Amino acid sequence: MEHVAFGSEDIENTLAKMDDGQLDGLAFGAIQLDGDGNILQYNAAQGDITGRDPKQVIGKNFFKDVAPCTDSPEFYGKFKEGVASGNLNTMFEYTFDYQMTPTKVKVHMKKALSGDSYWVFVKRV
């Protein structure tokens, strides 16, 4: 397993060295999006939670297609502001409930080290 704690201050630095293979070792969900909400990476842990297939969601809009239950001021609203500002680091509780059992999780959004990429870290609570 890759030893990285959810909410770690330097998490964007640590994860810059990973690949899809290495990301699959994390204890929590991790989604990498571009400036437009498109999925660039999708680890095995978020798949265990949402039931999605990582390899099948890659390339689709996170907010439009895959997870419309996030299209909201509380989530998407926060993402867009972050993207436009060029900085993003917020943590909140959300309920995943689209075509799945209503699941309470902890969501950590943070801008990555790379120019135009954003992290979505998730964990059951």
Ligand X SMILES: *C(=O)/C=C\c1ccc(O)cc1
Which residues between 81 and 120 bind ligand X (CB under 6 A)?
Answer: 96, 98
Indicate which single residue of 70, 83, 108, 110 sits in contact with ligand X (rule: CB under 6 A).
Answer: 70
Beta carbon of residue 10, minimum distance to ligand X (angstroms, whole number): 25
- The 10 Å Cβ neighbour count of residue 89 is 13
Of the residues 23, 26, 66, 109, which one makes contact with ligand X according to CB under 6 A = 66
Only segment of 4-12, 67-75, 84-92, 111-119 that touches ligand X (CB under 6 A): 67-75
DSSP 15-64: GGG--HHHHTT-SSEEEEE-TTSBEEEE-HHHHHHH---HHHHTTSBIII
Residue 15 in contact with ligand X, rule: CB under 6 A: no
- For residue 29, give the nearest of 37, 83, 85, 39 by alpha carbon: 39
Q: Is 30 in the site for ligand X (CB under 6 A)?
A: no
Q: Which residue has the tokens 């059951």?
A: 124
Residues lying near ligand X in the complex (CB under 6 A) are found at 50, 52, 66-70, 96, 98
